[PDB]
Design a binder for this molecule. Structure first.
Ligand code: NAG
Ligand code: NAG
Ligand code: NAG
Ligand code: GLU
Lengths: 81, 305, 53, 45, 212
């Protein structure tokens, strides 16, 4: 649909105060500011994978049936004559 | 500048202030010297610039011609002109007369089919008129034209205001782009916008929230960004703090609380207004010109015979 | 040959523009006037369709 | 779920599409986002 | 339009080339009158029928675009109330005014969030509503804010004027008095009884509901 509400993000969860926090955050920022996230989006997500036959298909079929019926009627008239 | 900062970062690092409220992106050097809270508005950097239907119809027309030939065999000059008469009566041009009953019935049925087809064509024209599209010249910062303007036939111009995160990121990413960009270092957003109108400049590279707002409140709706935007360095705005300041946890939790119940959406609606003709048939006229060129070529081909 | 009193039918049929055989035109002024009136009828029916919409 | 596993000590890091919000942020420390999005509705056409 | 003149030139060129093809094929006025009858409505006949199809497609497209021009792109001379950003941020083009020193002035001054509108209106505040209606009738004003009853009656009297859609700050009309006075309870009860029976309906029918 159209609307887009409650905009948030995705995070890499950790413990409470832990020695692997600031380095992970800085690495995420450094990957954002160059083209690595763009390459990932290209490979995984960004990669992508009138007619006049809706209300006239049945109409065309019925027209063909009527044409066949008219041909049969022509044959009947020829036989009558 | 030589291990010397200035501005809001300069006032925060050297303890002349405790936080810097204003608009301020997030990147590696600033995160190394200070501490940022969670982003509450997202702003990257972006760019601102000013088949078988005919076949089945032909098959049915051949069927009609065969029916007309059969009618002529049964019971005057409409042998090879049956197609001509049928397609002339398609458009009801009154071109200067059916006589057989079967021929009249077939002509009437095909006229009804042409009527429903022209009604569908009017509906298609209405749908096409409803459909409206803009034109985007540049696809991204790495567009073919942006690769080397001098190489391209027109040496178009594009610049950004220096002394910014945007300039720094472009310098780190693509040196040639910066080399060419240096010539048009127009200062200030307001002064920059005017050159875009006059044509002295062609493209503009800046934040995304700023450009969205300035396109929204523009009078006349002449300038339009390219696609969604945030086409690179998708970042947010933060509230700088001194390293280790005890306010960080409380400020983070408060900002998350505000975001989680629609107050930020209310503020965005209140302070940012995002809005959103004449007859033109250039494509149709070009198609008509191509079709008439084909017709006259066919006539020239048949000229010898 | 008989367009003295039978021109009303021709004009009324060409008002609706249903390609009804009425009479073969011969006069140049009559043909031009009929063409202009047919264009007027076409734009009038377009306006009527717009009014219906 | 994953948050219970992380808090109980059975894991040291959660690498998954985890959303940032107040109730989780009170108990664990997230990193900065690597993907910006919102919510939307899916219908069949 | 200009495209119509270009199409006229194109059909004239097509007629000229058809005449040349007729001359080359192994008469003049007849072909000219045939072109006159076709452009408005055997080698050359195929070209004639194809051009007739082109003309039908062109008149269909012209009908579609004229319908669009008369339906969609319609100027919005209305304001749709206070929620117009064009009046949120005013200029020297849209001139909306009111009567100086009335209830509307108090209402706009009290709300600080309408400070821009309050500063803008103070240059065009008029002495009387009759003068304001006269000025807007003389194409000097662009908008006017006043009570619904008066504006609707004036619109009914003078058909050139039209009101907007939004309706805000709903209130009533009262009968002022001094402070605590003996004439209060009885007056209020009389008003209530006149409402409940048919007297106010009769008054509205005779003075306000009627159409000139
Ligand atoms: C994380 O970054 C800090 C920057 O202050 C650095 O001192 C530390 O060495 C980094 N982590 C590791 C494991 O090296
Ligand atoms: C700001 O930009 C001007 C113009 O290029 C330059 O002269 C100046 O050195 C810059 N200052 C800083 C602090 O970057
Ligand atoms: C009208 O007012 C008088 C006093 O002035 C009072 O005695 C009387 O009851 C009133 N009528 C009512 C309340 O219907
Ligand atoms: N708000 C951005 C603007 C970037 C720019 O002006 O180039 C910053 O301060 O980094």
């Amino acid at each position: 649909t159209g609307e887009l509400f409650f905009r948030s993000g995705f995070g890499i969860g950790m413990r409470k105060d832990s020695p692997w926090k600031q380095n992970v955050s800085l690495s995420i920022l450094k990957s954002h500011e160059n083209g690595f996230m763009e390459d990932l989006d290209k490979t995984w997500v960004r990669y992508q994978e009138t007619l006049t036959f809706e209300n006239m298909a049945g109409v065309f079929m019925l027209v063909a049936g009527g044409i066949v019926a008219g041909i049969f009627l022509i044959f009947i008239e020829i036989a009558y004559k | 500048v030589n291990n010397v900062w200035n501005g809001m970062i300069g006032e925060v690092v050297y303890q002349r202030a405790v936080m810097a409220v204003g608009s301020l992106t997030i990147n590696e050097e600033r995160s190394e010297v200070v501490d940022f809270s969670v982003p509450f508005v997202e702003t990257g950097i972006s760019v601102m610039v000013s088949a078988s239907v005919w076949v089945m119809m032909f098959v049915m027309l051949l069927i009609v011609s065969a029916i007309a030939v059969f009618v002529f065999e049964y019971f005057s000059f409409t042998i090879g002109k049956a197609i001509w008469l049928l397609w002339g009566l398609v458009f009801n041009n009154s071109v200067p007369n059916p006589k057989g009953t079967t021929s009249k019935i077939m002509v009437s049925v095909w006229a009804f089919f042409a009527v429903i087809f022209l009604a569908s064509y009017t509906a298609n024209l209405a749908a096409f008129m409803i459909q409206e599209e803009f034109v985007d010249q540049v696809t991204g910062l790495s567009d073919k034209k942006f690769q080397r303007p001098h190489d391209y036939s027109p040496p178009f111009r594009f610049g950004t205001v220096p002394n910014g995160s945007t300039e720094r990121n472009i310098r780190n990413n693509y040196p040639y782009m910066h080399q060419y960009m240096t010539r048009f270092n127009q200062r200030g957003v307001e002064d920059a916008l005017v050159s875009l109108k006059t044509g002295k400049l062609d493209a503009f590279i800046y934040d995304a929230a700023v450009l969205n707002y300035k396109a929204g409140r523009d009078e006349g709706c002449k300038l339009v960004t390219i696609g969604s935007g945030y086409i690179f360095a998708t970042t947010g705005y933060g509230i700088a703090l001194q390293k280790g300041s005890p306010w960080k946890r409380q400020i983070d939790l408060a900002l998350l609380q505000f975001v989680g119940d629609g107050e930020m959406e209310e503020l965005e609606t209140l302070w940012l207004t995002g809005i959103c003709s004449s007859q033109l048939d250039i494509d149709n006229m070009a198609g008509v010109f191509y079709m008439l060129a084909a017709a006259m070529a066919l006539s020239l081909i048949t000229f010898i015979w | 040959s008989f367009t003295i009193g039978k021109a009303i039918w021709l004009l009324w049929g060409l008002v609706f523009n249903n390609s009804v055989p009425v009479q073969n035109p011969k006069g140049t002024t009559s043909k031009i006037m009929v063409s202009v009136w047919a264009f007027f009828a076409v734009i009038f029916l377009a306006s009527y369709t717009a009014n219906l919409a | 779920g994953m948050m219970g596993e992380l808090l109980s000590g059975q894991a040291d890091m959660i690498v998954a599409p985890l959303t940032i919000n107040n109730e989780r942020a009170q108990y664990i420390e997230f990193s900065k986002p690597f993907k910006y999005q919102g919510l939307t509705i899916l219908v069949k056409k | 339009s200009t495209l119509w003149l270009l199409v006229g030139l194109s059909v004239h060129v097509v007629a000229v080339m058809l005449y040349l093809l007729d001359r080359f094929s192994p008469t003049l006025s007849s072909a000219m009158w045939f072109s006159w009858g076709v452009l408005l409505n055997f080698s050359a006949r195929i070209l004639g029928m194809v051009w007739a199809g082109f003309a039908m497609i062109i008149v269909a497209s012209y009908t579609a675009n004229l319908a669009a021009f008369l339906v969609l792109d319609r100027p919005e001379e209305r304001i749709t109330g206070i929620n117009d950003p064009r009046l949120r941020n005013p200029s020297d083009k849209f001139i909306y005014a009111t009567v100086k020193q009335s209830s509307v002035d108090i209402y706009f001054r009290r709300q600080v969030e309408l400070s821009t509108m309050y500063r803008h209106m103070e240059k065009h505040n008029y002495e009387s509503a009759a003068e304001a209606i006269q000025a807007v009738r003389d194409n000097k004003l662009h908008a006017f804010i006043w009570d619904s009853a008066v504006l609707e009656f004036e619109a009914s009297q003078k058909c050139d004027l039209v009101t907007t859609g939004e309706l805000f700050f709903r209130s009533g009309f009262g009968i002022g008095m001094r402070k605590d006075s003996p004439w209060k309870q009885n007056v209020s009860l009389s008003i209530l009884k006149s409402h409940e029976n048919g007297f106010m309906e009769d008054l509205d029918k005779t003075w306000v509901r009627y159409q000139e």
